[PDB]
Enzyme design. Structure first.
Site: not given
Ligand SMILES: O=C(CNc1ccc(F)cc1)N[C@@H](C(=O)NO)c1ccc(Br)cc1
Ligand SMILES: [Zn+2]
Length: 888
Positions: A123, A265, A267, A300-301
């Site tokens: 990403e 981090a 995902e 979050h991830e």
């Protein structure tokens, strides 16, 4: 090339299957790729253009026929163009073999080496640095991935999906094949190879009772720091089950820590990859902040698995649909796990300092931007944190029951598909219609939160008729025009309100959310027995500038007696802001007029009394107490001052802190001493699974009070500082370093704490941060010492950020009128940009307020930004960022 939101069009091609062979060798990595492709219904005979950045072509083929460079294709190190006449008209296979070089990839995008771990970051645009692709998130495909490597150096091989084969290879090598049949965008691909050690657990899902294997990985040295992350993963899984009814769908979930990472981090499906500072901790070798950070980043991830991975993005302009929504899910989770009011307050504190600054800067953008050059430049606090507040307002408007109904509508209708911000608003609108019992009700106005940039200002006037028992709140909203809209429209602003009886502190009405949908409105309340004090924007219910128009007497009563933590904290904030602006202008006038004497307005004595009352309340919250003795952040203050003279602001803060300490230092000292037993309790020091957020808040309070007492040179406080340096908790002994700055013992503690920090990579970075933000007159010489003795030539982003960013918050020294601090950071940005453009742009952060400062400092910052822009080798990322920031 500028990409525009309105120009979205589906590709003329389809990629159905990716078959990868990634062969890792000491001096190079060979990537072979077969893409099973088709022609889409949108095809109009165009050339076949792949993204491919920095690839060395060995060969490319269509249908197993090798293509000829120049006659049948061109490659310019950015785009591979296969001319139309050689592109098949039905299903076909494109294949390629390229060479890439993870070992020299210091930009940390694509495939790269972090210490002895090979790892990818795709990403947003990194997959094209690994192999040719139509590298955009609406190109969904199946992935079959084989990785081979030297077995001794890389025993652990990971990619997405199920490991379906493991095999030996002559010459000391080995391979593993991973097949991931569910469709995914290429930015979610990941591969990891290394000598990884792990902790593992089995999770059984709530409803289908599926067994999910959980693995957390790190290098061998730090495997003992993985236990909290694994606990946080279990918690995240349970929360999505309990709040949202959502279970994990795969058999396994891997988390991997690496030392070199551009952000927190990422995902990648089933293979989340983390900055080591957001996965690894131990009580001996980490500060307290690491525990909340790992909790929120793991959460979050994990929450991305639905909001980002199962429901994905049509295009990058929808970024806030996964990032704002996942931060909102992250925040709900954190609030539920920590059970402390300071969790929500810390989010608001971040938004109103960092994100409000961005939204009033030349970089201001809506949470769904209209255009970009480098999409990496729009992973911003606006998209993330204002996005999260926009996602949170749906819950405020709907209530928990109808919010959950709308969220499930969004998941069920878009699972397995791409989506846009409108799809989410549509799902919430269905819940809105249900809630209002009105199928004519709509949220069309709500969409302006996605398209309108800038922070709204909401202001109030009040009327109370004592004979009629009738109370009125008149509300106005206004957004300043900027470069994105000349005309700003009124937004749908939910205003959570209470009414406090000033005679007994009691609530006067039931829970109420005013829905302000016009430029102005008057909200009237009957049977209001006495004139109330309004408690406005409870929970910080909309991302706005609140102008409460209350007296300091009213704000003090709210601070003492209101039920809502945010309104109490905001009332305190507002009292401080009134004082800061008044004293700032008094210092400014004396400077401008060269006065030999002048007066300063003292701090309100009843405000100081109220602080003391709260600090002395043994039933009040320690984390909240630490907020009330702290002035508002400099980057919050600067939104309220034109041509801010940073020296005058430093003098203002110093006066106000001295005013309060002259009255309360004895209270501060007494509390510092009495908090010791519970704050520093060691009962669970060797239990990594036992995390007590209230205890850490008591340490925060102690360390805040210690800082206040040290700046004040409170009698014999050095004794307390030296004793503090012997605490087993890094939060405490690193605090002892920073507060010792005001004493002759600083370099003694510098050496002591360095010795304690130097053998843990992450702890050393915390030490670097502590030195960097030390309030030292000799800070420039100290930074040179860090450069020469510790940082050296490191390309690790954690190291560079640790040395320089905290220093940029030194209001007196970074903003030295010579410009030497601006010059120093600009040199670091230009140096960093040669190998890591993303981190170079992160290091530009202090320049974001350049046009808010006094005229001399504006000019000094502009000169360094224009020097940076004139560098011949400047990256596209850094050039776009500085061009937008300087309005050029
Ligand atoms: O990690 C963060 C935010 N935290 C952070 C911490 C330290 C930093 F220096 C910078 C950022 N965002 C992730 C994300 O959203 N993961 O799900 C992300 C993923 C891909 C891209 Br491209 C950008 C950002
Ligand atoms: Zn994210």
């Amino acid at each position: 090339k500028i990409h525009y939101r309105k120009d979205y069009k589906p590709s003329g091609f389809i990629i159905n299957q990716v078959t990868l062979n990634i062969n890792i060798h000491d001096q190079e990595t060979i990537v072979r790729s077969v893409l099973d492709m088709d022609i889409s219904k949108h095809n109009v005979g165009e050339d076949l253009v792949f993204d491919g950045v920095g690839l060395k072509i060995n060969e490319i083929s269509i249908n197993n026929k090798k293509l000829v460079e120049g006659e049948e294709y061109t490659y310019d190190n950015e785009f591979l163009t296969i001319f139309s006449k050689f592109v098949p008209k039905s299903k076909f296979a494109f294949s390629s073999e390229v060479i890439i070089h993870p070992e020299t990839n210091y930009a940390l995008t694509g495939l790269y080496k972090s210490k002895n771990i090979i790892v990818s970051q795709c990403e947003a645009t990194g997959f094209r640095r690994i192999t040719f692709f139509i590298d955009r998130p609406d190109m969904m495909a199946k992935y079959d991935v084989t990785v081979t490597a030297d077995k001794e150096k890389y025993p652990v091989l990971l990619s997405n999906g199920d490991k379906v084969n493991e095999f030996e290879i002559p010459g000391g090598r080995h391979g593993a094949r991973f097949n991931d049949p569910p469709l995914k965008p290429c930015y979610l691909f990941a591969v990891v190879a290394g000598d990884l050690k792990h902790l593992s657990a089995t999770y059984i899902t709530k409803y289908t009772k599926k067994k999910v294997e959980l693995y957390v990985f790190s290098e061998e040295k730090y495997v003992s720091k993985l236990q909290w992350a694994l606990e946080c993963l279990k918690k995240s899984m349970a929360f999505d089950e309990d709040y949202f009814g959502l279970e994990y769908d795969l058999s396994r979930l891997n988390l991997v820590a690496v030392s070199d990472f551009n952000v927190g981090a990422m995902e990648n499906k089933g293979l989340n990859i983390f900055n080591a500072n957001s996965l690894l901790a131990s009580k001996k070798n980490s500060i307290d902040f690491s525990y909340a950070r790992i909790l929120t980043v793991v959460g979050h991830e994990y929450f991305h698995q639905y909001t980002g991975n199962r429901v994905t993005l049509r295009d990058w302009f929808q970024l806030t649909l996964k990032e704002g929504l996942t931060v909102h899910r992250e925040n709900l989770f954190s609030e539920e796990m920590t059970k402390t009011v300071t969790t929500r307050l810390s989010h608001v504190d971040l938004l109103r300092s960092v994100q409000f600054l961005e939204d009033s800067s030349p970089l201001s953008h809506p949470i769904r931007p209209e255009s970009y050059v480098s999409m990496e430049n729009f992973y911003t606090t606006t998209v993330y944190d204002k996005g999260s507040e926009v996602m949170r307002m749906y819950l405020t408007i709907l209530g928990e029951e109808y919010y959950k109904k709308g969220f499930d509508i969004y998941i069920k209708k878009n699972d397995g598909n791409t989506a846009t911000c409108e799809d989410f608003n549509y799902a919430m609108e269905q819940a809105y219609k249900m809630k209002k019992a009105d199928n004519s009700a709509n949220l069309n106005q709500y969409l302006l939160w996605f398209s309108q940039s800038g922070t709204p200002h909401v202001s109030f006037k009040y009327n109370y008729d004592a004979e009629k028992k009738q109370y009125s709140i008149h509300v106005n909203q206004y957004t300043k025009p900027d470069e994105n809209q000349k005309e700003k429209k009124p937004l749908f602003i939910p205003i959570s309100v209470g009414l406090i009886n000033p005679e007994n502190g009691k609530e006067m009405i039931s829970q109420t959310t005013l829905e302000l949908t016009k430029e102005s409105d008057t909200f009237v309340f009957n049977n209001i027995a006495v004139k109330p004090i309004p408690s406005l924007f409870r929970g910080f219910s909309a991302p706005v500038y609140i102008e409460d128009q209350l007296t300091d007497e009213e704000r003090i009563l709210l601070l003492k007696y209101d039920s809502d933590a945010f309104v109490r904290y905001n009332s305190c904030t507002n009292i401080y802001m009134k004082q800061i602006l008044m004293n700032y202008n008094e210092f400014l006038k004396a400077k401008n007029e060269k006065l030999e004497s002048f007066q300063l307005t003292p701090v309100n004595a009843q405000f100081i009394d109220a602080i003391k009352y709260l600090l002395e309340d043994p039933h009040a919250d320690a984390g909240f107490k630490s907020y009330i003795v702290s002035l508002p952040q400099d980057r919050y203050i600067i939104n309220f001052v034109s041509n801010l003279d940073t020296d005058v602001l430093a003098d203002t803060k110093e006066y106000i802190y001295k005013q309060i300490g002259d009255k309360l230092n004895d209270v501060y000292y007494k509390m510092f001493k009495s908090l010791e037993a519970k704050a520093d309790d060691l009962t669970y020091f060797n239990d990594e699974s036992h995390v007590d957020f209230d205890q850490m808040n008591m340490r925060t309070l102690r360390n805040t009070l210690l800082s206040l007492l040290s700046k004040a040179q409170y009698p014999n406080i050095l004794n307390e500082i030296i004793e503090h340096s012997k605490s087993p908790y890094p939060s405490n002994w690193l605090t002892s370093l920073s507060v010792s700055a005001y004493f002759d013992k600083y370099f003694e503690l510098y050496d002591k704490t360095y010795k304690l920090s130097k053998d843990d990579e992450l702890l050393l970075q915390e030490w670097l941060k502590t030195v960097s933000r030390s309030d030292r007159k000799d800070i420039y010489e100290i930074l040179k010492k860090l450069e020469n003795e510790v940082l050296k030539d490191s390309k690790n982003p954690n190291d560079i950020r640790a040395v320089y960013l905290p220093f940029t918050n030194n209001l007196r020294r970074f903003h030295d009128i010579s410009g030497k601090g601006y010059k120093l950071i600009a040199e670091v940005i230009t140096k960093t940009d040669k190998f890591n453009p993303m981190v170079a742009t992160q290091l530009c952060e202090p320049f974001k307020l350049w046009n808010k400062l006094d005229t001399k400092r504006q000019e000094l910052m502009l000169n360094e930004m224009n020097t940076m822009l004139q560098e011949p080798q400047i990256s596209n990322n850094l050039k776009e960022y500085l061009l937008r920031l300087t309005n050029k």
